[PDB]
Design a protein around this ligand. Structure first.
Ligand code: HEM
Lengths: 438, 55
């Protein structure tokens, strides 16, 4: 039984949430923000990512060089990432270096220079990032997947933004973005590891007390997405490996089917030929794929957002004449979530998940990420007892009922990259979303 | 004719051959499709379709 997550508020509405571990000597403190690329419009798309670069480019006090030195002297490191719905800025340090790290984070968030000279310098760095993501095939695939599934909607935009915006982002629009979005009621200060909650609340009162509150404070993790069944083909015959993602509209964080979708995802599961145990996994798809050498890997996913999600699978394969078989067998395993699954598969997946959801949290950064994600999506940290109860409530009837309304005979979004000549057209893929025998 | 003019022998032989010939015709129809399958169908532009195939 893990220690209790303590939670306090300030007057402005900043949440402080902490989970102490007296067995470790490091601590991860940081700020989780319920804001991301989705908060931009089409004209300033890319701003949130642009800001993340400038946050480390110097503040009103410390210059770029002083900032570097201050963190070097702390001994740990700082890290940040911007997603579609969430921004994180954290600092991993030693136990007694926590007041330094909180102070630096408070500085870079509230008091950043955003000097025209630095805007102009990063404008090239970010322009170069546009031509080098091209190599990270999984990210290429998932960014096209969002672009097509949520065609012309805010979730469909990339985080980097178009080349055109990168050239026209001003310090004005950067400042406007962080003034509108980085408000106290949307922020959580999180500490995990060797942190005292009461110490962290004092540091919050010292550094984050003059944060703006929004005019209309909605609860944390408050949002209409209209999924488009569609496909993007990025054929490249010179690549040896095909990367394919197939997804349907999935579930939001607060859906009543959130756990049912996780159990269904666990019934299909993951596979990787390079891992020794993967040839012996219980999943039917795993057995088909491994016995027939259909793929190097596959990974089931169930991504959630505040008001929608994508549920599906990501496949990689060198077997370019049997891509059809790989896709066929994958979608026939999905069909069986509607037609055939019983207590046998459901209870096995629940067993595997009850541990999996706890196992994931194995370091201070993972714990901090879990507290931060849960607080900014659900408004609370859900105790393992509650999670165990929600998983236990999933029956085989729930899985079949969910699959029949979410997967069965539904439109898919499909992205293929690489040697995908063998991937059939949209209709033949989408026809595998049902079984004529049922 | 099987005789000196068109008559009964000719009619009976035309019946047997008229029954047979459609089966021969079906075999040749199949042969020309098997022969075609090496190049595939041509298309109205006259160019290769190897770049863009549909089931
Ligand atoms: C019983 C008579 C026949 C049947 C059932 C038949 C059936 C077919 C079929 C199904 C195809 C492929 C689809 C199409 O292109 O329409 C085809 C292609 C072709 N047939 Fe026929 N056919 C017959 C007679 C003929 C005759 C009399 C010729 C030539 C004098 C011919 C020459 C061809 C050729 C050259 C093609 C390839 C055309 C292409 O796709 O570019 N067929 N036939």
């Amino acid at each position: 039984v893990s220690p209790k997550t303590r939670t306090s508020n300030l007057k402005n509405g900043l949440t402080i949430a902490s989970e102490s571990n007296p067995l470790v000597q490091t601590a991860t403190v940081g700020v989780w923000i319920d804001a991301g690329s989705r908060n931009e419009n089409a004209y300033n798309n890319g701003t949130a990512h642009f800001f993340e670069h400038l946050a480390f480019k110097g503040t009103d006090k410390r210059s770029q060089h002083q900032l570097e030195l201050d963190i070097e002297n702390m001994g740990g490191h700082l890290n940040a990432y911007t997603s579609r719905e969430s921004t994180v800025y954290y600092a991993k340090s030693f136990k007694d270096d926590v007041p330094k790290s909180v102070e630096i984070l408070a500085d870079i968030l509230q008091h950043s220079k955003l000097a025209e000279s630095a805007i102009d310098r990063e404008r090239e760095v970010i322009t170069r990032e546009l031509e080098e993501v091209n190599k990270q095939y999984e990210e290429v695939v998932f960014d096209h997947l969002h672009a097509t599934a949520f065609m012309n909607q805010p979730l469909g935009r990339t985080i980097l933004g178009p080349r055109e915006n990168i050239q026209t982002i001003t310090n004005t629009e950067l400042r406007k973005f962080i003034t509108e979005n980085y408000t106290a009621d949307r922020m959580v200060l999180v500490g995990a590891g060797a942190v005292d909650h009461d110490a962290l609340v004092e540091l919050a009162e010292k550094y984050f007390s003059h944060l703006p509150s929004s005019q209309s404070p909605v609860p944390l993790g408050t949002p209409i997405p209209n999924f488009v069944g569609s496909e993007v083909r990025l054929r490249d015959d010179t690549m040896p490996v095909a990367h394919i993602a197939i997804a349907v509209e999935g579930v939001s964080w607060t859906s009543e089917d959130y756990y049912t979708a996780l159990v269904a995802q666990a019934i299909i599961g993951n596979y990787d030929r390079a891992v020794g145990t993967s040839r012996h996994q219980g999943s039917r798809l795993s057995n088909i794929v491994s016995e027939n050498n259909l793929a190097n890997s596959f990974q089931s996913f169930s991504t959630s957002y505040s008001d929608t999600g994508l549920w599906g699978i990501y496949l990689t394969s060198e077997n370019t004449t049997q891509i059809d078989d790989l896709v066929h067998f994958t979608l026939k395993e999905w069909n069986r979530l509607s037609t055939s699954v019983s207590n046998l598969q459901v209870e096995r997946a629940k067993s595997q998940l009850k541990a999996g959801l706890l196992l994931s949290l194995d370091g201070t950064t993972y714990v901090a990420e879990d507290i931060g994600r849960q607080l900014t999506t659900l408004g609370r940290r859900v105790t393992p007892a509650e999670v165990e109860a929600k998983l236990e409530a999933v029956t085989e009837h729930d899985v079949r009922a969910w699959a029949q309304k979410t997967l069965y005979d539904k439109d898919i979004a499909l992205v293929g990259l690489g040697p995908i000549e063998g991937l059939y057209d949209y209709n033949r893929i989408r026809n595998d979303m049902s079984m004529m025998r049922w | 004719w099987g005789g000196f003019s068109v008559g009964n022998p000719t009619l009976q032989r035309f019946f047997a051959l008229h029954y047979l010939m459609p089966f021969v015709l079906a075999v040749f129809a199949l042969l020309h499709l098997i022969a075609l399958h090496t190049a595939g169908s041509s298309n109205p532009l006259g160019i290769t379709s190897n770049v863009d195939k549909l089931s």
